[PDB]
Enzyme design. Structure first.
Site, PDB file in Angstrom:
ATOM      1  N   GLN C  15      -0.490  83.500  54.096  1.00 33.75           N
ATOM      2  CA  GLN C  15       0.720  83.183  53.388  1.00 33.75           C
ATOM      3  C   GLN C  15       1.042  81.710  53.509  1.00 33.75           C
ATOM      4  OE1 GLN C  15       3.878  85.897  54.179  1.00 33.75           O
ATOM      5  NE2 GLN C  15       5.294  84.868  52.765  1.00 33.75           N
ATOM      6  N   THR C 170       9.980  90.278  65.843  1.00 37.04           N
ATOM      7  CA  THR C 170       8.896  90.637  64.935  1.00 37.04           C
ATOM      8  C   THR C 170       8.037  91.724  65.541  1.00 37.04           C
ATOM      9  OG1 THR C 170       8.749  88.427  63.879  1.00 37.04           O
ATOM     10  CG2 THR C 170       7.007  90.034  63.486  1.00 37.04           C
ATOM     11  N   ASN C 219       7.350  78.138  55.242  1.00 38.26           N
ATOM     12  CA  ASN C 219       5.984  77.732  55.161  1.00 38.26           C
ATOM     13  C   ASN C 219       5.856  76.419  54.452  1.00 38.26           C
ATOM     14  OD1 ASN C 219       5.356  79.991  56.513  1.00 38.26           O
ATOM     15  ND2 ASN C 219       4.620  81.093  54.723  1.00 38.26           N
ATOM     16  N   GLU C 245     -10.684  61.770  65.688  1.00 33.35           N
ATOM     17  CA  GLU C 245      -9.928  60.923  66.578  1.00 33.35           C
ATOM     18  C   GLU C 245      -8.725  61.621  67.189  1.00 33.35           C
ATOM     19  OE1 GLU C 245     -10.591  57.455  67.436  1.00 33.35           O
ATOM     20  OE2 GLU C 245     -12.497  58.093  66.755  1.00 33.35           O
TER      21      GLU C 245
END
Ligand code: POU
Ligand code: GTP
Ligand code: GDP
Ligand code: MG
EC number: 3.6.5.-
Lengths: 128, 431, 431
Positions: C15, C170, C219, C245
């Protein structure tokens, strides 16, 4: 005199036999280490897992308690008598550490063994 | 896709199931003839979860209906959706068992089951990924419990890795509607515990209370009661049927709800349940929903969670809402009422969100609680059980069916230990 | 050419990916149909018709998620075989994700990856997106990394991960899955970027001044961070920083490699009009605890290394000045470090996604930060684990999938060491 012989005998009950008590506790400890491997116990019909946990914790405390006692009792003995406190070619406190490390190292080894087996299994699957 | 087999057993089970399928068909745009007339592609897209696209545009709910005798399933076939079912999935005998668990699990059921399972096998064969099984049955029923229990065992035998869950109807703490409840229920549980992966407890008693109170109803007809139950059931699998933000597979629910095998009994709840007379005086917010969800009065199981602690709670939301609202709100509950949650487990809440609301409810949620207070139920049962058992009450109606008295003592043993287990965890502490 | 392969695993991974690729297309002018009505060959390949095909692999045992993608706006941007799905998810069970389910998919995944890798002229590394706690994300990724590191022992292994935030929910079995993954992650990952949903919510509330956010914009914020990082490869800058790096400039000791992240200047247009977002201004904002993407008050520990990525209208000298000020701000750094600042500058300013909730700016700063403060979070996690593990809650779900009970002990052991490592680093080495 006989009294002195009996005095160190009582020390030995708290020392010599004290080690045996440590060893007995240690044995039981090992029995819990063994029993823990039986996955069937997850179906704890009697609440077994809680019972087990209490006992595991108990033994974890006991083994240190006994060792600390023995550290003092062996000192008393060797202060009261010149003979080094050892049996079967090993000092009783060394013996304590010996079995401890025996278990430790074996457990660690066995873990590593299986880790390797998993690594070889992974390798095999990549080769497949 | 993943598929679920819906088994209905007993008069109760079948009546509930009838309503269930009504609800499901409605949500997927399926009419009584099995023809698709939905609006969203989603309705059809994942219809496979329950229906088997037979031919043309005719979908056939993959359900199996079972009873020891006709006069029940018959009425189902005479109903609105009778024709939606495939005739061959109606399996029934020609004998009763007046709440005679023994008959249901032995002398009668042992014959009927020989068929039944064959159908089950066929249905499972038509599946691509058999999610699991759902059994709608009623405890205390000669069929529901008798056959129910039997079938469960038989299924696990061949599908040990599938998720089995049932929506049992439990005994009422108040007036019992059967005489030999204690026996039948206890005998069922004796085996149920060691089989079914998770099971829900719904008690008509509690449902009546909700209706008379929260729903402001005066004529709580069984059809209405079933409707309510059906809603809960549909919520449970919405995550499979529809897209969302946090989909929770049936299996997932088991994982976050069962901490120890055996301890897999749940108290279902549902929100919103506002009566039409007062719907206009509501806000319908995430907070509102949680107020209802954690309201002991909205528990569909006749127990008072207030006297126990939650091992774990699942909250499934449908429709639209923010993630922020949900998470924060659920947190608040745990914080404000931390004493009601078991300290052993950090985060006692599992959440899930589907983007498809119930028809007419922009926001809705189901509540699945694993409370130790359920102990109460089992306690009641055991007590009543031994009261009768010690007098050998009606045992001849079981002994006469070839039941070994020892089975009762074993049943009790399991029951009592179940209680003990809950009691241990009830007050067991981290330190 | 410098090329990069993205991998998206699980609900979150995928997602999030949706948001990311949405953004990538926007920045490069690529239209949903892979059309471009000169820095694309890093994330995109050219087909016979010229069409662009993003370089990523989506894996999710729960086909639902991917189906959303397959039927979504950007369904034309993916080569079917880049969308790998399973039939059944991991049910928040690391063991399923790693040992029993993921095991049967991983072969496919790796093959697909290999073929993708074989299209490259010079692979820089991989970008893996997943969540701790997710059976797939957590469990499967563990497996994936284990094997990727074999074939590509010298490629950069970067990952982004959702770190079960201290106070959110959750799932319940989180800390189990989380640790189980970490235990293996430490041996393969080059650098992980921790992000908390919790922290983000706070940011949305206070910086964006919004309410009711979902993953649809949570998101988006995250994707800005990702873009900021890869912008170095994709656009010319005063100080371009190759992915390699980041190891050198973030990790100072193998086992420690969990940078935190932030991103300034988050802000609504409302405030944008009233505020001059200067280089110095922004730079300061990056070190304000409030703006971190991880629930960890950085003041509790010391900094090990920081990396700043500037985009858009910035001036080297101004940047230097700002940093010098930061150094003055008696923000603590470990004695092991004397510099602590590695800075990249990219000419390509930040963009803005149509319909987004973030004002467009002329310049922005993304910061990565390795700090000992994170040890706190690890401790919290371990603590939670201990509590559940003690009673062996939910353990049978893992053991039933072939996991070794001792494996939990092993993982915990290593975690203890990890925490200890952080302690040692912050010792303030002195004669
Ligand atoms: C949290 C799980 C939960 C346990 C408790 C104790 C919770 C806590 C809170 O709800 C979340 C109570 C809540 O904040 C309110 C005060 C607004 C309120 O709803 O409380 C009830 C009474 C309360 O029990 C006393 C309720 O029955 C209940 O269950 O409460 C009367 C009600 O009249 C409108 C209203 O005044 C069980 O699922
Ligand atoms: N930021 C963000 N977090 C997410 C999203 N989806 C899930 N999460 C978080 O990820 C964690 C759950 O893991 P998921 O990725 O949903 O699980 P999964 O990888 O699909 O694994 P299974 O469902 O267990 O097979 C929780 O902490 C969620 O809050 C998302 O779109 N954005
Ligand atoms: N909720 C609900 N309960 C029912 C229904 N029909 C019967 N019951 C309940 O189910 C129990 C009786 O079992 P029943 O299913 O009729 O017996 P069986 O056919 O032998 O399984 C009692 O507790 C009834 O109150 C129904 O349609 N809905
Ligand atoms: Mg998933």
């Amino acid at each position: 005199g006989a009294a002195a012989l009996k005095n160190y005998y009582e020390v030995h009950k708290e020392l010599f036999e004290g080690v045996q008590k440590w060893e007995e506790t240690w044995r039981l400890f090992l029995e819990f280490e063994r029993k823990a491997s039986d996955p069937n116990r997850f179906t704890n019909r009697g609440g077994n897992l809680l019972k087990e946990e209490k006992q595991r914790a108990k033994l974890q405390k006991m083994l240190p308690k006994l060792e600390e006692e023995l550290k003092a009792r062996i000192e008393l003995w060797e202060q009261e008598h010149s003979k080094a406190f050892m049996v079967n070619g090993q000092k009783f406190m060394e013996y304590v550490a010996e079995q401890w490390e025996m278990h430790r190292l074996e457990k660690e080894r066995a873990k590593q063994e299986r880790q390797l087996k998993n690594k070889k299994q992974t390798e095999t699957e990549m080769l497949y | 896709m993943r598929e679920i087999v819906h088994i209905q057993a007993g008069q109760c089970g079948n009546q509930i199931g009838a309503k269930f399928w009504e609800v499901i068909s409605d949500e997927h745009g399926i009419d009584p003839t099995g023809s698709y007339h939905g609006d969203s592609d989603l309705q059809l897209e994942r219809i496979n979860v329950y229906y088997n696209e037979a031919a043309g545009n005719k979908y056939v709910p993959r359900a199996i209906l079972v009873d020891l005798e006709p006069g029940t399933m018959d009425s189902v076939r005479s109903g609105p959706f009778g024709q939606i079912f495939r005739p061959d999935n109606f399996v029934f005998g020609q004998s009763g068992a007046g709440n005679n668990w023994a008959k249901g699990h032995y002398t009668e059921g042992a014959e009927l089951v020989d068929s039944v399972l064959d159908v089950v096998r066929k249905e499972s064969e038509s599946c691509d990924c058999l999610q699991g099984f759902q059994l709608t049955h009623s405890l205390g029923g000669g069929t529901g419990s008798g056959m129910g229990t039997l079938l469960i065992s038989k299924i696990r035998e061949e599908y040990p890795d599938r998720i089995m869950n049932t929506f049992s109807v439990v005994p009422s703490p108040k007036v019992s509607d059967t005489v030999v409840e204690p026996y039948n229920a206890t005998l069922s549980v004796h085996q149920l515990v060691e089989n079914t992966d998770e099971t829900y407890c719904i008690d008509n008693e509690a449902l009546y209370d909700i209706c008379f109170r929260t729903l402001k109803l005066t004529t709580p007809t069984y059809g209405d009661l079933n409707h309510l139950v059906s809603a809960t059931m549909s919520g449970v699998t919405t995550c499979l049927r529809f897209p969302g933000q946090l989909n929770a597979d049936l299996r997932k629910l088991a994982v976050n709800m069962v901490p120890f095998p055996r301890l897999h009994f749940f108290m279902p709840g549902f929100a919103p349940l506002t009566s039409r007379g007062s719907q206009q005086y509501r806000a319908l917010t995430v907070p509102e929903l949680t107020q209802q969800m954690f309201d002991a009065k909205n528990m569909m199981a006749a127990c008072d969670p207030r006297h126990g602690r939650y091992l774990t709670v699942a909250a499934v939301f449908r429709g639209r809402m923010s993630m922020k609202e949900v998470d924060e709100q659920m947190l608040n509950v745990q914080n404000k009422n931390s004493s009601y949650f078991v300290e052993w487990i950090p985060n006692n809440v599992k959440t899930a969100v589907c983007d498809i609301p119930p028809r007419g409810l922009k926001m809705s949620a189901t509540f699945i609680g694993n409370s130790t207070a359920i102990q109460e139920l089992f306690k009641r049962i055991s007590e009543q059980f031994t009261a009768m058992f010690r007098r050998k009450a009606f045992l001849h109606w079981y002994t006469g069916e070839g039941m070994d008295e020892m089975e009762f003592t074993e049943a009790e043993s399991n029951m009592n230990d179940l209680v003990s287990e809950y009691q241990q965890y009830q007050d067991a502490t981290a330190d | 050419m410098r090329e990069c392969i993205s991998i998206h695993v699980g609900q979150a991974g995928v997602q999030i990916g949706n948001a990311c690729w949405e953004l990538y297309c926007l920045e490069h002018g690529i239209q949903p149909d892979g059309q471009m009505p000169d820095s694309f060959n890093t994330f995109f390949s050219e087909t016979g018709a010229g069409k662009h095909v993003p370089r990523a692999v989506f894996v999710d045992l729960e086909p639902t998620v991917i189906d959303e993608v397959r039927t979504g706006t950007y369904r034309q941007l993916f080569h079917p075989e880049q969308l790998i799905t399973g039939k059944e998810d991991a049910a928040n069970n690391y063991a399923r994700g790693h040992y029993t389910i993921g095991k049967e998919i991983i072969d496919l995944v790796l093959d697909r990856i290999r073929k993708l890798a074989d299209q490259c002229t010079g692979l820089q590394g991989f970008l893996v997106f997943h969540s701790f706690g997710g059976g797939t994300g957590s469990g499967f990724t563990s497996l994936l990394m284990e094997r990727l590191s074999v074939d590509y022992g010298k490629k950069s292994k970067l990952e982004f991960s959702i770190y079960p935030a201290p106070q959110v929910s959750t799932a319940v079995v989180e800390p189990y899955n989380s640790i189980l993954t970490t235990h293996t992650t430490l041996e393969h990952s080059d650098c992980a970027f921790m992000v908390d949903n919790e922290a983000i919510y706070d940011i949305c509330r206070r910086n964006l001044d919004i309410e009711r956010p979902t993953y649809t914009n949570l998101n988006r914020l995250i994707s800005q961070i990702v873009s900021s990082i890869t912008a170095s490869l994709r656009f010319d800058g005063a100080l371009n920083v190759d992915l390699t790096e980041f190891q050198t400039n973030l990790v100072p000791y193998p086992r420690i490699h969990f940078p935190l992240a932030t991103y300034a200047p988050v802000i609504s247009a409302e405030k944008a009009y009233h505020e001059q977002l200067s280089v110095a201004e922004i730079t300061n904002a990056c070190f304000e605890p409030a703006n971190q993407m991880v629930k960890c008050d950085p003041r509790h520990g010391k900094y090990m290394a920081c990396c700043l990525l500037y985009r858009g209208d910035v001036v080297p000298k101004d940047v230097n000045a700002a940093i010098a000020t930061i150094k003055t701000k008696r923000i603590q750094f470990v004695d092991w470090c004397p510099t602590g600042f590695k800075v990249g500058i990219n000419y390509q300013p930040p963009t803005v996604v149509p319909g987004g909730d973030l004002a467009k700016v002329q310049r922005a700063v993304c910061m990565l930060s390795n700090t000992t403060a994170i040890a706190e979070a690890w401790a919290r996690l371990d603590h939670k684990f201990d509590l559940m593990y003690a009673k062996r809650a939910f353990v049978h779900w893992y053991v039933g999938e072939g996991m070794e009970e001792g494996e939990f002990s092993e993982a915990r052991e290593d975690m203890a060491a990890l925490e200890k490592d952080y302690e040692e680093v912050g010792v303030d080495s002195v004669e």
